[PDB]
Amino acid sequence: PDLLELLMDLNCYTLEVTEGYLKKVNVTEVNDNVLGPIHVITTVVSSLVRNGLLIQSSKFISKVLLTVESIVMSLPKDETMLGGIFWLSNLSRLPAFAANQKTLYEAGDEKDKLTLIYLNDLENETLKVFDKIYSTWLVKFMKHASAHIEIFDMVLNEKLFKNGDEKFAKLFTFLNEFDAVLCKFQVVDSMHTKIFNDTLKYLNVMLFNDLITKCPALNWKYGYEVDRNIERLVSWFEPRIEDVRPNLIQIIQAVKILQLNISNFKLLFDFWYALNPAQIQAILLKYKPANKGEAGVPNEILNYLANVIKRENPGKMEIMLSAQFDSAKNHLRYDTEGLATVSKII
Numbered sequence: 001p002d003l004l005e006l007l008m009d010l011n012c013y014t015l016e017v018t019e020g021y022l023k024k025v026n027v028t029e030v031n032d033n034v035l036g037p038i039h040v041i042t043t044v045v046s047s048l049v050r051n052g053l054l055i056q057s058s059k060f061i062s063k064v065l066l067t068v069e070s071i072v073m074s075l076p077k078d079e080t081m082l083g084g085i086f087w088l089s090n091l092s093r094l095p096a097f098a099a100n101q102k103t104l105y106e107a108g109d110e111k112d113k114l115t116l117i118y119l120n121d122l123e124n125e126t127l128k129v130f131d132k133i134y135s136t137w138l139v140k141f142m143k144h145a146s147a148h149i150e151i152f153d154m155v156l157n158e159k160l161f162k163n164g165d166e167k168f169a170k171l172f173t174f175l176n177e178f179d180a181v182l183c184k185f186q187v188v189d190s191m192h193t194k195i196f197n198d199t200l201k202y203l204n205v206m207l208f209n210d211l212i213t214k215c216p217a218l219n220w221k222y223g224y225e226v227d228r229n230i231e232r233l234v235s236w237f238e239p240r241i242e243d244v245r246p247n248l249i250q251i252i253q254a255v256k257i258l259q260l261n262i263s264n265f266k267l268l269f270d271f272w273y274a275l276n277p278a279q280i281q282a283i284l285l286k287y288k289p290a291n292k293g294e295a296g297v298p299n300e301i302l303n304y305l306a307n308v309i310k311r312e313n314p315g316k317m318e319i320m321l322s323a324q325f326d327s328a329k330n331h332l333r334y335d336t337e338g339l340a341t342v343s344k345i346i
């Protein structure tokens with residue numbers, strides 16, 4: 001009918017969506033409104049698929065994903081959190097949408113094998129883009145949030161080991177707003193959870209890298225104080241997700257090592273992989289006795305470690321950490337103008 005004719009004018013309804021709706025949405029005025037992008041998007045695709053216009057759907061989705069990625073990439077530092085969550089929440093439903101569409105073309109009725117293949121792919125691909133955008137935004141978001149909430153001075157700075165009620169209060173208040181926005185913008189439960197687990201994974205990297213670079217003196221007492229802070233921070237996460245600490249295993253082991261002994265080790269490291277020989281050295285080469293004029297790291301031990309390093313130095317070793325996140329795969333379970341509307345009415 002007049003629908004098919006409408007649906008074939010690709011360039012026109014694609015431009016309405018990316019330029020007239022998407023690139024304009026203001027997250028500050030969003031609230032409802034949250035799932036507006038996904039609604040518009042799935043409305044068009046659902047119609048296109050129902051009518052066999054697969055290359056069209058492909059074209060439309062491709063342009064839409066480039067637009068959303070660009071918007072998020074160019075988000076202003078003061079909107080990185082609201083905007084990143086808003087958009088990812090929306091894009092987070094594409095895979096579930098794709099999967100659900102498949103039920104309409106399986107079985108009952110005739111099986112449109114090609115459409116299934118199209119949908120199956122739509123799901124795999126929208127997940128690939130969601131992952132790429134997610135990872136990039138989480139690192140950026142957390143890079144700025146760590147600075148603003150002063151995590152290093154709150155957790156690792158020794159000459160500041162006297163207070164941390166001032167800062168931790170602010171941290172918990174940052175986490176509360178974070179959690180609230182993920183709620184308000186309807187991020188799915190599993191995705192919500194994953195976001196906190198990954199947030200901790202980022203902090204693991206940041207805390208560990210900083211410990212090795214901005215902390216000159218380390219000792220048993222440094223371990224007790226730092227551990228006490230890690231628990232303070234982990235407490236907020238404890239009730240909200242399961243398995244909090246494993247996300248912080250490098251900073252935690254590093255700290256447990258400091259609360260050490262003096263007498264030979266060989267059995268507790270010759271097989272250690274939570275932290276590698278070169279990383280344990282980096283920690284222990286910063287050892288400065290707490291009590292002025294006290295014991296340090298037995299050179300024979302520091303020596304065994306030094307020896308184990310040299311032998312398989314393979315082609316490298318690696319001390320610094322880098323944040324890497326798993327695919328949101330098993331975590332994404334769920335349930336305008338002219339042309340854009342004219343479609344929505346048929």
